[PDB]
């Protein structure tokens, strides 16, 4: 029957095989296994029949191995897989034919250079994708690459080499994290249709300009992080926007702030109250800003200068 690899721990539907220097995926594991942890081993590839009889596996952890090659439909048998963690490996591209039940994919710190729309089509359960720390470029991501995922709620591409915000992002998105890349500008086209986006993380990039109408394309944005960039003015549209509440702009090159940069002409009862605004580490000093500039901020501690 089922065998437990020497040194591994097989207890209650869990197969713990971490830190053992394994050179390949062990076979003959208990059929009812629900979580297989192969973290920190020395696996180089996932052959076509590495996961047979693991119909009940919902979590697969392959973090910190040496995987550089994965056979198509290698995860085909994992008909109940919900989490696939492949972070800290040597993947050049994302694997094809991932279980349709997949809810989360993490490929942080690999060698991904290209992202095709083909790899994601059909994945209607995906809610979270993390692609940070990869030598990926904007040209490497196809327009509409994440389009095929009807339920995608969170996407994070951080510490890569992308220079623009990917185009054709799934409208179901509520959080878009692109911190620590090489983005130089925010264009309204890339944010078109993001009706449910609530959080936008663009900190630690090289953004110098934010096109007019960008923020309007994310009508319900609540949190906007643009700190540690190269802005020379507060992005436009904040005064008209009705849902924005947190705007971090510290560590930029803003030297002036108009009286209508955050708040509309007088008082708009329809515009939500700012709960946080950061402006420290910018050329502008508190003494160069009319007090009225923050009239629509009643919580004094909300602004940091």
Ligand X SMILES: *[C@@H]1O[C@H](CO)[C@@H](O[C@@H]2O[C@H](CO)[C@@H](O)[C@H](O)[C@H]2NC(C)=O)[C@H](O)[C@H]1NC(C)=O
Ligand Y SMILES: *[C@@H]1O[C@H](CO)[C@@H](O)[C@H](O)[C@H]1NC(C)=O
Is 250 a residue that touches a second copy (CB under 8 A)? no
CB of 252 to ligand X, least distance (A): 9
Is 160 a residue that touches ligand Y (CB under 6 A)? yes
- Using CB atoms within 10 A of its CB, is residue 13 exposed (0-12), middle (13-18) or buried (19+)? middle
Q: Which of residues 41-70 bind a second copy (CB under 8 A)?
A: 63-64
- Using CB atoms within 10 A of its CB, is residue 105 exposed (0-12), middle (13-18) or buried (19+)? buried
Among 5, 18, 116, 189, binds a second copy (CB under 8 A): 18
- Strand partners for 114: 93
**Which tokens belong to 2?**
């089922």
CB of 132 to a second copy, least distance (A): 6
Q: Which contacts (CB < 8 Å, 24+ apart) does range 170-175 have?
A: 170/146, 171/195, 171/196, 172/196, 173/197, 174/198, 174/199, 175/199, 175/201
Is 271 a residue that touches a second copy (CB under 8 A)? no
CB of 281 to ligand X, least distance (A): 11
CB of 292 to a second copy, least distance (A): 30
**Which tokens belong to 9?**
């721990």
Q: Are strands 185-186 and 209-210 parallel, antiparallel or unpaired?
A: parallel
Among 253, 259, 281, 293, binds ligand Y (CB under 6 A): 253
Q: What is the binding site for ligand X (CB under 6 A)?
A: 135, 159-161, 230, 232, 253
Is 6 a residue that touches a second copy (CB under 8 A)? yes
Is 128 a residue that touches a second copy (CB under 8 A)? yes
Instruction: Catalog residues that contact ligand Y under the rule CB under 6 A.
Output: 135, 159-161, 212, 230, 232, 236, 253
């Amino acid at each position: 029957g089922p065998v437990c690899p020497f040194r591994c721990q097989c207890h209650l539907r869990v197969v713990q095989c971490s830190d053992l220097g394994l050179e390949k995926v062990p076979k003959d594991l208990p059929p009812d296994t629900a979580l297989l942890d192969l973290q920190n081993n020395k696996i180089t590839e996932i052959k076509d029949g590495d996961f047979k009889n693991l119909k009940n596996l919902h979590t697969l952890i392959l973090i910190n191995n040496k995987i550089s090659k994965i056979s198509p439909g290698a995860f085909a048998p994992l008909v109940k897989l919900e989490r696939l963690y492949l972070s800290k490996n040597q993947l050049k591209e994302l694997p094809e034919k991932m279980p349709k039940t997949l809810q989360e994919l993490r490929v942080h710190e690999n060698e991904i250079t290209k992202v095709r729309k083909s790899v994601f089509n059909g994945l209607n359960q995906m809610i979270v994708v993390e692609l940070g720390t990869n030598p990926l470029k904007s040209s490497g991501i196809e327009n509409g690459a994440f389009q095929g995922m009807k339920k995608l709620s969170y996407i994070r591409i951080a510490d890569t080499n992308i220079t623009t915000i990917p185009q054709g992002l799934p409208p179901s998105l509520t959080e878009l994290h692109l911190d620590g890349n090489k983005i130089t500008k925010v264009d309204a086209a890339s944010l078109k249709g993001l009706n449910n986006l609530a959080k936008l993380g663009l900190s630690f990039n090289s953004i110098s300009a934010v096109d007019n109408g960008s923020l309007a394309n994310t009508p319900h944005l609540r949190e906007l992080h643009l700190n540690n960039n190269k802005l020379v003015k507060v992005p436009g549209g904040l005064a008209d926007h009705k849902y924005i509440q947190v705007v971090y702009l510290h560590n930029n090159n803003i030297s002036a702030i108009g009286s209508n940069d955050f708040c509309p002409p007088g008082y708009n009862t329809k515009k939500a109250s700012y709960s946080g605004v950061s402006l420290f580490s910018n050329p502008v000093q508190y003494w160069e800003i009319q007090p009225s500039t923050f009239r629509c901020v009643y919580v004094r501690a909300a602004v940091q200068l």
